[PDB]
Amino acid sequence: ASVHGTTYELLRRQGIDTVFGNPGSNELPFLKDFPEDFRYILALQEACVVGIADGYAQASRKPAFINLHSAAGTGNAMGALSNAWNSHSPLIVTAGQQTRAMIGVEALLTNVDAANLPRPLVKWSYEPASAAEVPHAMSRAIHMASMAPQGPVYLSVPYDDWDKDADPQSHHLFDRHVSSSVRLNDQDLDILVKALNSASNPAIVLGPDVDAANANADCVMLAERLKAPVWVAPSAPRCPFPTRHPCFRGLMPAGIAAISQLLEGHDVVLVIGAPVFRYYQYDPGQYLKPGTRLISVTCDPLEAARAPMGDAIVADIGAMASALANLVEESSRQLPTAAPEPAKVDQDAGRLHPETVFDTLNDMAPENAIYLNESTSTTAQMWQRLNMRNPGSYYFCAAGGLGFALPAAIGVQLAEPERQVIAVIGDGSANYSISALWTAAQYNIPTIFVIMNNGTYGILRWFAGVLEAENVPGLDVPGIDFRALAKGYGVQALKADNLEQLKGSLQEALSAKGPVLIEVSTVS
Amino acid sequence: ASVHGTTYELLRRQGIDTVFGNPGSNELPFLKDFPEDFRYILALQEACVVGIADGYAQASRKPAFINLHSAAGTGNAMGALSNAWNSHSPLIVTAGQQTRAMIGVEALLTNVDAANLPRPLVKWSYEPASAAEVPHAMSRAIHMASMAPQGPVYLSVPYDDWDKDADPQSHHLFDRHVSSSVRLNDQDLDILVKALNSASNPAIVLGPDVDAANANADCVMLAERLKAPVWVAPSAPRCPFPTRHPCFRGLMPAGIAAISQLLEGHDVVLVIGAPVFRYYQYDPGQYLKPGTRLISVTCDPLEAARAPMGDAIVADIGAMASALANLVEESSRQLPTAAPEPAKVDQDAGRLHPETVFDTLNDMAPENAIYLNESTSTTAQMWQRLNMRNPGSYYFCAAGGLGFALPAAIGVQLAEPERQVIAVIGDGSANYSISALWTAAQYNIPTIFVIMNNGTYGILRWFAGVLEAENVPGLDVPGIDFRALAKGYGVQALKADNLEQLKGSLQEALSAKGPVLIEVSTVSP
Amino acid sequence: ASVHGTTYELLRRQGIDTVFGNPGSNELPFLKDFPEDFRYILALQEACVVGIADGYAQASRKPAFINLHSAAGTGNAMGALSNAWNSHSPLIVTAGQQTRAMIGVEALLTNVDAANLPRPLVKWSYEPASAAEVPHAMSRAIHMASMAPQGPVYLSVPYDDWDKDADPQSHHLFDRHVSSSVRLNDQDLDILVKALNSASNPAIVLGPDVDAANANADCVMLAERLKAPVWVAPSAPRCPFPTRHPCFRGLMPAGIAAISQLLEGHDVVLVIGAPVFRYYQYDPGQYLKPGTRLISVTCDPLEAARAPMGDAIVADIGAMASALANLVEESSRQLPTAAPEPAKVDQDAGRLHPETVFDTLNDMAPENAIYLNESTSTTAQMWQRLNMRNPGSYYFCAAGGLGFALPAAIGVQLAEPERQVIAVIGDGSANYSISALWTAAQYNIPTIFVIMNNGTYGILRWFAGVLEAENVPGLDVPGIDFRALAKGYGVQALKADNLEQLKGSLQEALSAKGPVLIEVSTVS
Numbered sequence A, C: 001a002s003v004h005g006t007t008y009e010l011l012r013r014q015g016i017d018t019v020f021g022n023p024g025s026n027e028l029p030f031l032k033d034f035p036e037d038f039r040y041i042l043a044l045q046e047a048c049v050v051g052i053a054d055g056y057a058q059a060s061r062k063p064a065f066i067n068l069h070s071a072a073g074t075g076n077a078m079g080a081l082s083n084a085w086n087s088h089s090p091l092i093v094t095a096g097q098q099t100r101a102m103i104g105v106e107a108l109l110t111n112v113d114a115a116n117l118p119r120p121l122v123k124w125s126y127e128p129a130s131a132a133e134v135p136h137a138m139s140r141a142i143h144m145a146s147m148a149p150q151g152p153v154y155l156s157v158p159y160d161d162w163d164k165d166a167d168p169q170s171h172h173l174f175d176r177h178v179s180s181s182v183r184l185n186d187q188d189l190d191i192l193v194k195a196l197n198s199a200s201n202p203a204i205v206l207g208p209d210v211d212a213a214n215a216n217a218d219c220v221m222l223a224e225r226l227k228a229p230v231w232v233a234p235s236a237p238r239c240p241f242p243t244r245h246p247c248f249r250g251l252m253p254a255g256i257a258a259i260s261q262l263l264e265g266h267d268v269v270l271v272i273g274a275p276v277f278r279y280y281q282y283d284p285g286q287y288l289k290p291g292t293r294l295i296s297v298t299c300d301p302l303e304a305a306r307a308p309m310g311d312a313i314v315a316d317i318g319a320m321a322s323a324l325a326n327l328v329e330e331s332s333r334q335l336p337t338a339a340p341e342p343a344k345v346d347q348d349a350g351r352l353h354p355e356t357v358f359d360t361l362n363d364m365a366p367e368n369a370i371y372l373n374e375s376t377s378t379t380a381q382m383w384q385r386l387n388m389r390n391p392g393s394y395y396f397c398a399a400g401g402l403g404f405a406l407p408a409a410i411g412v413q414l415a416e417p418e419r420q421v422i423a424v425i426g427d428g429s430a431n432y433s434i435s436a437l438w439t440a441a442q443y444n445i446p447t448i449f450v451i452m453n454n455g456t457y458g459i460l461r462w463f464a465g466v467l468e469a470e471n472v473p474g475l476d477v478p479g480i481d482f483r484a485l486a487k488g489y490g491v492q493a494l495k496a497d498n499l500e501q502l503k504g505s506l507q508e509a510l511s512a513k514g515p516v517l518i519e520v521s522t523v524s
Numbered sequence B: 001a002s003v004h005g006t007t008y009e010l011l012r013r014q015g016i017d018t019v020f021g022n023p024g025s026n027e028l029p030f031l032k033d034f035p036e037d038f039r040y041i042l043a044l045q046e047a048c049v050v051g052i053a054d055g056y057a058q059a060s061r062k063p064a065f066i067n068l069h070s071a072a073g074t075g076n077a078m079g080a081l082s083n084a085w086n087s088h089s090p091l092i093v094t095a096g097q098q099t100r101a102m103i104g105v106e107a108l109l110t111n112v113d114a115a116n117l118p119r120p121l122v123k124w125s126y127e128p129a130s131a132a133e134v135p136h137a138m139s140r141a142i143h144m145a146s147m148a149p150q151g152p153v154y155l156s157v158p159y160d161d162w163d164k165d166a167d168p169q170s171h172h173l174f175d176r177h178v179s180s181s182v183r184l185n186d187q188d189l190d191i192l193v194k195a196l197n198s199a200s201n202p203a204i205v206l207g208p209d210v211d212a213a214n215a216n217a218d219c220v221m222l223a224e225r226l227k228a229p230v231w232v233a234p235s236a237p238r239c240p241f242p243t244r245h246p247c248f249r250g251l252m253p254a255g256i257a258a259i260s261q262l263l264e265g266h267d268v269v270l271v272i273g274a275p276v277f278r279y280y281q282y283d284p285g286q287y288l289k290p291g292t293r294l295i296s297v298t299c300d301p302l303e304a305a306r307a308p309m310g311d312a313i314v315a316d317i318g319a320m321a322s323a324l325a326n327l328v329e330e331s332s333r334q335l336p337t338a339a340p341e342p343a344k345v346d347q348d349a350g351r352l353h354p355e356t357v358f359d360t361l362n363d364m365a366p367e368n369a370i371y372l373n374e375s376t377s378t379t380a381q382m383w384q385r386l387n388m389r390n391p392g393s394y395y396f397c398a399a400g401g402l403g404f405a406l407p408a409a410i411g412v413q414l415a416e417p418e419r420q421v422i423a424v425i426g427d428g429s430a431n432y433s434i435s436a437l438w439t440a441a442q443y444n445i446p447t448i449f450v451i452m453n454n455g456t457y458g459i460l461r462w463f464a465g466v467l468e469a470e471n472v473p474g475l476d477v478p479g480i481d482f483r484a485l486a487k488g489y490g491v492q493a494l495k496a497d498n499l500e501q502l503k504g505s506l507q508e509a510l511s512a513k514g515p516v517l518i519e520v521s522t523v524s525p
């Protein structure tokens, strides 16, 4: 058997049947004789390729396979990999390398010191020392990406390797099962449950790894058992809790003082599946107010190590959430009261307020809709106004790297064809991966794109105000016609200059058969 | 003085007055109080920001300054940095980092292992140990970028550093002059000259570093004195020789066997300013045929070390080219036999052949026009059919990384407002950096973009053909409206479905005052 | 408080009270005002510092703290870090950096690209961006080194940081508890238990991580339950099992074909706490013969991902071994019969056979002795002839990096003052970290060093034979007088040119009160 055949059988047996790519000469030998049982998803830009695979991996909760072209292709994908690292996305990234005979002279398309290129944004980077080693390296890549903490991995393969003969003993690779679904030992776990039962005013904080492990339901039960208010960790890449649940308290502000102030009065704080903490703005103060004890459960050793306070437990979030939810006593305390419904903002017949857009989406979108957010100046309003009952309903670039939501929305839609994906993207962020639109049109992926157009870098303007910075250039982005951009890539475009038009467009988009883009004129 | 004021004074004193950027919160403290003598050029994407800066640096023959945001921004620009490494572009890439007080907890926007991120694609990568060191670090970066072999450098700066006090002794950095324009010592230089003089059949091979050093004229004199045929190194990122000069033989095919054959018979082969060699396709054979002696002159130690044959000299192209040009004696040998004329290919009144397009461009474009090529399948024909007699008249992505030409065509146009830039770009390549068009509109850079739309990844379909590779997915890119994309970013758009329309389109484009995009319906392979 | 005080308090609160080091100017501001509750162990060389700390960490099953000088000091120690990586030794390596004001100009003693230097032989490499962060960085290092899979970490600190003001919120670091004591979920653990109970002919293979977790007893129980033969994985760094137990089958030869042959007939092979596998010699063949299924329990994701065959479970060895040992049913199968005692080799009145030396050590050493092996050409003989009943009784360079055993023997002896340490080192290996002897004499660490002198690189001479390689230079090391070297460093020395002198020297050595070195004349 050839390395080519052996490799595809490996992918197939490990449950991988989709290839997200942008091709090059180095990758032709691998793409040739493409298995009929495999699917290839072309994106025009590498940043788009990874974004789409990222959305697909996250929604499907399974590793995604990518094929890029040498250093140039890998390089273009770097920004996307930065997000994938933060969101623990299981991405197997392969890139074609020059033929071994030509690597020495550094011929054109040679990926120099290839393993080093994507570092430090991957848990594993590797180039095999021989063709026969390739299947085994691929097997390594598959399990490294899938083991906790999940993350992107990198593999470089010289194009001449694929036709070579593969080692017959590679058959042992096909059916390897690697598990990391583990939880705290019985003894220590009982001590933890003791502590939770004995707390007089517990609070719970959930991060994206809860949604990734589909432990949302288990967390809901745990909260109901402890009668505890629930928060989502700051800078949230996902949503791990029904946002209308009486326990839900909303998105924590990404500041040190702000968070210790919020947790004040809570004697024990259970953090599940989140870093402690993913702060953003400079907000000096106490990490925790005296009287508050923090206990962290995380799947990532790097997160437990760098937390500046509290105890940490490194385990699988799914197994841990399940264990706790089923072991804690039912507290007699009153169940928390659901937060009040957001106030209706005053809306004239002009440009729409971000609050109005969200309220309208909430009224018109299906109950099982999936939202992506890359509208940076309106994130807070988005969490308050969208009712998200189900898991996997929200995605936001995990490292703050723009260009994520647009291609990811296509990947997510591909992963969940029964759920309407609605991406809310700012006029600024939209340009980073605009060409992903073409993939949506080409593969009939009925994703809905809502472009929030206020002609500027909203968030940046705000920051410039709180720093008091004057004469800052490059904050404005006038002169972009997004309907023409969407026509450029074969996507139906609509405009919403006002509320009347916004409802009309939303109704039309929801009904349309293919992907639709709506340009909304929002206030500055 | 603040680190902010000191750093801007250093850039000012070092001849930098332009900043290509895409801003983020980590960079606000730096962009604030933007000096009135500085000019900021905004790009919607990072790849686009770097590409434009690259074109600007290569055409101006001076280092370019870039400001990006954290790892996300730097990452988006990696593909572009691969090209820049290969073309020795002097680029100074600075990226904002999180406040020092917030790095430890790895807050959002922290650039982890910052200096490691752009490796191995930069000459130098660094994050200062404190605020006061920032100005010094910036100096190191400026000089690392400008010193032979020129290249991109990376500097990460925590945003809280800008408002801090600078070391008073930082003033010593302002007027620092560093020179690397050196040449072979007199003794060894005379020996080399003697070799060239005694050669009975020398050949010359020029690389992109010749055009970078503006050594084209000196190389012409040298070629004329030696009466030697002149070739351009394979995968040529630039043009270092008048393509219509009688010594010019053309672009070398990127194959080991193809090159040894072309050089057969030449007792002495002098290679100037090129890697040896930048092969591409697998084309196994002899590196050099017996009886052929090769001498390479490079400014990059890495190039001299990796060459699989010949002697090498690591020196400044400018100085070396000038020295040799004026040292070699005039040979009485006869000039090289005149090269045949590119045939006028068959063309009906339907979709245009790439050759028809190049012939028309060469007939209508000004003598001092600058071309940028990102049409991968038509490169060979472009070189045969375009008369480029001046320096700085050609750019092609140096590492083969697509997404170069479009933004770079804007950078080049900015650097040379008196020369008409004409980007020839395949429908595939055009998508990698499409948003760059917005920058041309916003700042009214009158670059002309010619999109060769054949609906496919031409070069790939061909390579798949020779490999007898059947059932290869992802080679077709149908359903792309480029006039609509141009409109989306505010650029005037025209279309050419046939020869007559192409001519009229070019005429209109050359008389336009702003950027113009022309979608050309070319024949699919 | 100062960064200096805060830091010593953190180490104190985290259980650290010993600094192994070799000082430099960059380390003076750290070492000044050395806390009275801390002890400092000086070594003449860096490879020796880390070797000693490594031995101490392995034997105490706790993280060892190290202090080295800048780049030159760190550099000198990288061979030893190579062993520590393979042994999963929890070493916290700290190295002084130039003052922040001088790093830019690259003054003398400046550690350029400090974080990159130790890579990739460390779990985590870091240099704080400010002095106030030093304490937090130290916290990360401590936890990163202690979390499974344990291993070495590296922190570079500019010497001017120590005298700076610490962040008051640093107090949150002091009592952080981080646990990775985890095991497979009940559901999946039940399936594994069933597979083991239904096994018709199971075998067990143990690695060094068993002895590290002190799960030896649990493994014994598991073995007796299942009535299964017990191997030790190849290239063994430690001894995870009593070598005279009825189930004990010995150390597996370090080859592919040899191991699959040995496992032939066993339907289920359970590998615990070992890579799969640490092969050495070139022995091509089947990874496993048909009919043999393999299950591996490892605490290291890198090991699980790279095994060429079998299923894997990534969990804590201590927790998993305990659960399994108490869950599996008692088999009705007949308990294996103990391996027959090794034959007595013929010994004339001249030089000594390695076999004779081990037989004599076994006869005269205490039952709780601790052996360290650096006699590369006599490892097999050593495993068969030494009866090691207890945990922590054997150590061997885990990456085959020589210069480990001499200093490590000192570290182990320091960690275990009640157990006699006996290091068996070849004349060749003795030279790599010879100056370590000084430390044993300085602090009167009564380690016994047995030098096997055959005046050559035995193992190398043997390998040159298999490859029929002739005319190989540098294989002989004549003219080394080890008694004079011991005298040079203040250690009592004895000689043994024959069996009668071996017995004599051994009795005196064991009766000795300080360290002793015995030079034994062994056959070629």
Ligand SMILES: Cc1ncc(C[n+]2csc(CCOP(=O)(O)OP(=O)(O)O)c2C)c(N)n1
Binding pocket: A079, A374, A375, A376, A377, A378, A400, A401, A402, A403, A425, A426, A427, A428, A429, A430, A432, A454, A456, A457, A458, A459, A460, B022, B023, B024, B025, B069, B072, B073, B076
């Ligand atoms: C790749 C990348 N480039 C730049 C930034 C910095 N950045 C963050 S938000 C933002 C403005 C986003 O504009 P828009 O999409 O309009 O959101 P708005 O603030 O207008 O709601 C920028 C430039 C980033 N986070 N990632």
Ligand SMILES: Cc1ncc(C[n+]2csc(CCOP(=O)(O)OP(=O)(O)O)c2C)c(N)n1
Binding pocket: A022, A023, A024, A025, A046, A069, A072, A073, A076, B079, B374, B375, B376, B377, B378, B400, B401, B402, B403, B425, B426, B427, B428, B429, B430, B432, B454, B456, B457, B458, B459, B460
């Ligand atoms: C960033 C990047 N991605 C992928 C490739 C591989 N690649 C080389 S040529 C090519 C197709 C280019 O098509 P087009 O621009 O239409 O030129 P044509 O071949 O059609 O003439 C691709 C995908 C590359 N060189 N750079």
Ligand SMILES: Cc1ncc(C[n+]2csc(CCOP(=O)(O)OP(=O)(O)O)c2C)c(N)n1
Binding pocket: C079, C374, C375, C376, C377, C378, C400, C401, C402, C403, C425, C426, C427, C428, C429, C430, C432, C454, C456, C457, C458, C459, C460
């Ligand atoms: C630092 C280091 N250098 C070299 C080697 C290679 N090596 C392994 S064993 C050996 C010879 C050891 O000889 P000795 O300690 O006398 O034992 P003998 O083979 O004589 O029994 C060498 C050179 C190594 N493993 N580590």
Ligand SMILES: [Ca+2]
Binding pocket: A426, A427, A428, A452, A453, A454, A455, A456, A457, A458
């Ligand atoms: Ca905006």
Ligand SMILES: [Ca+2]
Binding pocket: B426, B427, B428, B452, B453, B454, B455, B456, B457, B458
């Ligand atoms: Ca094309």
Ligand SMILES: [Ca+2]
Binding pocket: C426, C427, C428, C452, C453, C454, C455, C456, C457, C458
């Ligand atoms: Ca020896």
Ligand SMILES: [Mg+2]
Binding pocket: A116, A117, A118, A119, A120, B116, B117, B118, B119, B120
């Ligand atoms: Mg890198």
